[PDB]
Paper text:
The present study determined the crystal structure of the TcXyn30B‐product complex. A 4‐O‐methyl‐α‐d‐glucuronyl moiety‐binding pocket required for glucuronoxylanase activity and Asn‐93 (which is likely involved in xylobiohydrolase activity) was structurally characterized.
TcXyn30B is a bifunctional xylanase with endo‐glucuronoxylanase and exo‐xylobiohydrolase activities. The present study provides insight into the mechanisms of substrate recognition of a bifunctional xylanase.
Numbering used by the authors: 18 to 473
Write the structure that this text describes.
């Protein structure tokens, strides 16, 4: 039989596990979803379903929340649980919990109500009084870190205790945090919340925080360091791997190494022994590209992001992919879903994320998938429950007729369902295809993404 394009999936060649997909709603953008700029109650629930319902939407499984460093909630600041200095590092801190966290607490409740497992809390900065520059903004260093003393003393343990208290407020209010980070883009010196550290400076604090959590009996997965690009994060990993005089490295305490895609993209594997996450990335150009899956390779096009995701898993070995803002009242590409007062416009970047997230569920494993032609790129995952999800990007200008072989399985696959994303389709379910001897034929449209989902 003639075969235009051959795709081979091998469930016996298995790679990294998957924790999931999602976004952030930091810097008060969570409040947008709850009607800050006029979103109706109908569309508040619609947006939450698009984001977090596996049946009605993308079923995102990770939410990245900001641990606020600010002493007010003006402009788009995230306010802190410890807005004012206790005076000295050993003084008893005064903590305030507002059951809100710039809208991120009710958002977390709503995501969890729809099944979201993972909440990643990440600080952009320690509160300013803990830092060398006495300012949450413009970088600066945690007082007491190697090379960075402060006249007010050593604030390292105070910052660790502060992060523990943020996590405790969440758990006591019924919303446990599962992943915890204490830096964002430590390379960056910017006008908003920021804080520095190289690899060895980050490692120093990782060990302090991990030992604090063990003393407190809190089970949580520690991350580092949300570097501004993939290569920039890779450069911190040697410092995280130095085994100190106590016989431990920071990597021993870490569960996930995290990085962003801005300064360099996740296109190669990081050299840690831990799982890695792409934890922030978007199109910050200011363009507005809601409807385009492919036109000319613009940074905000749907295919661009379908390919960013597929590459991050296949070539950069990540276990999760977290966009920047999910939904926001803007007309730029910074968020996946544009809100225009009481109007909801999910972009093709959203639908590309949804194609992956709806069918590649937590604890899935990536498996080998190859393509006979460079115009068709493939990825494949086997879920806990046996469902196999195969993502195919056809960048040809014509439809492509695929022969897809699933190899040896321990129970023959009998049906598979395609779900297509393109200039014409958001996430459109096609007719089921019969599978014979673990092989099936399928045509995919020009310039498109298709998720093929097997039935158990
Ligand atoms: C599928 O196959 C197609 C070809 O058929 C490939 O399409 C090309 O994709 C590349 C990106 O990979 C495109 O190049 C990029 O174009 C962006 C959009 O340009 C439009 O808008 C600008 C405004 O300046 C117009 O001038 C232009 O004519 C277009 O209308 C640019 O914004 C990009 O620039 C950015 O990246 C470059 C390179 O790093 C930087 O130098 C820039 O400063 C900026 O940061 C870039 O030039 C290209 O246009 C596409 N070609 C065609 C014919 O469409 C897809 O890449 C491929 N997809 C996959 C997944 O393989
Ligand atoms: C909740 O959010 C939704 C989604 O954003 C809001 O509904 C949109 O409201 C805006 C205005 O606020 C409308 O924008 C107008 O669109 C006109 C063109 O609309 C046609 O083309 C659309 C492109 O696909 C299409 O979706 C739309 O179909 C919808 O409306 C038809 C007419 O009532 C109806 O027959 C369909 O079944 C479907 O409901 C039209 O064919 C344009 O000419 C205007 O200038 C303006 O831009 C959107 O059309 C609305 N979209 C939908 C799907 O309703 C909604 O108001 C928000 N609030 C509530 C309470 O629901
Ligand atoms: C892709 O990422 C995965 C993580 O998602 C990497 O998996 C890691 O692989 C290393 C092997 O090089 C495992 O380390 C080994 O651990 C055992 C004990 O568990 C130890 O005895 C060995 O000496 C070695 O340290 C590590 O466990 C594993 N991590 C996970 C979370 O499974 C994988 O290596 C990455 N692939 C590439 C090409 O980088
Ligand atoms: C539509 O507004 C968006 C801004 O255009 C966009 O720059 C961004 O601004 C945020 C800023 O986000 C950072 C983007 O770069 C990343 O490297 C970094 O980790 C992010 O923190 O964060 C600080 C905040 O003050 C800015 O408003 O996102 C805006 C948005 O709401 O989407
Ligand atoms: C509240 O936070 C603001 C912002 O970090 C603090 O103001 C900064 O203070 C430093 C140190 O004096 C200055 O270098 C910056 O210029 C200030 N920034 C701004 C925007 O004013 C302020 O000190 C904090 N207040 C309290 C009581 O902690
Ligand atoms: C919230 O979104 C609305 C709708 O996009 C914004 O209002 C528009 O703003 C642009 C300029 O940025 C104007 O061209 C439109 O005429 C405005 N429309 C309306 C109905 O006012 C609004 O500015 C956004 N607000 C925030 C804080 O982001």
């Amino acid at each position: 039989a003639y075969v235009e394009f051959q795709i081979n999936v091998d469930l016996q060649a298995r790679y990294q596990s998957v924790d999931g997909f999602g976004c952030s709603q930091a810097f008060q953008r969570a409040e947008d979803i709850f009607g800050k700029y006029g979103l109706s109650p109908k569309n508040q629930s619609y947006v939450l379903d698009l984001m977090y319902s596996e049946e009605r939407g993308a079923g995102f499984t990770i939410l990245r929340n900001g641990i606020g460093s600010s002493n007010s909630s003006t402009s788009n600041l995230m306010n802190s649980i410890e807005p004012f200095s206790p005076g000295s590092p050993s003084s008893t801190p005064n903590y305030t919990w507002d059951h809100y966290n710039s809208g991120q607490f009710p958002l977390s409740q709503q995501a969890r109500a729809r099944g979201l497992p993972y909440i990643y809390a990440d600080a952009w900065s320690a509160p300013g009084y803990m830092k060398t520059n006495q300012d949450e903004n413009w970088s600066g260093f945690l007082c007491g870190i190697e090379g960075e003393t402060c006249p007010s003393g050593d604030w390292r343990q105070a910052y660790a205790d502060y992060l523990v208290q943020y996590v405790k407020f969440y758990a006591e209010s019924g919303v446990p945090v599962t992943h915890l980070g204490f830096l964002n883009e430590p390379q960056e010196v910017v006008s908003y919340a920021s804080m520095g550290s190289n690899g060895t400076q980050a490692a120093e604090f990782v060990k302090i925080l991990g030992q604090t959590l063990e003393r407190e009996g809190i089970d949580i997965e520690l991350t580092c360091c949300d570097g501004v690009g993939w290569s920039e994060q890779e450069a911190m990993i040697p410092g995280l791997q130095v085994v100190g005089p106590d016989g431990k490295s920071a990597e021993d305490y870490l569960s996930v190494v995290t990085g962003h895609g801005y300064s360099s993209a996740p296109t190669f594997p990081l050299s840690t022994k831990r799982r890695t996450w792409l934890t922030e990335w978007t199109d910050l150009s200011g363009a507005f590209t809601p409807y385009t899956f492919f036109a000319d390779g613009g940074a905000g096009e749907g295919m661009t992001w379908a390919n960013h995701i597929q590459t991050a898993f296949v070539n950069a070995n990540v276990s999760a992919f977290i966009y920047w803002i999910g939904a926001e009242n803007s007309t730029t590409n910074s968020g996946m879903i544009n809100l225009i007062n009481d109007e909801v416009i999910p972009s093709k970047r959203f639908w590309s994320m949804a194609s992956f997230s709806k069918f590649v569920r937590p604890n899935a494993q990536r498996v080998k998938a190859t393509s006979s032609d460079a115009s068709v790129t493939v990825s494949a995952f086997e879920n806990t429950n046996g469902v196999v999800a195969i993502q195919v990007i056809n960048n040809g200008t014509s439809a492509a007729s695929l022969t897809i072989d699933l190899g040896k399985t321990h129970k023959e696959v009998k049906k598979v369902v395609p779900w297509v994303t393109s200039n014409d389709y958001d996430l459109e379910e096609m007719s089921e295809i019969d599978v014979k001897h673990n092989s099936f034929l399928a045509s995919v449209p020009a310039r498109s993404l298709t998720s093929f989902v097997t039935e158990c």
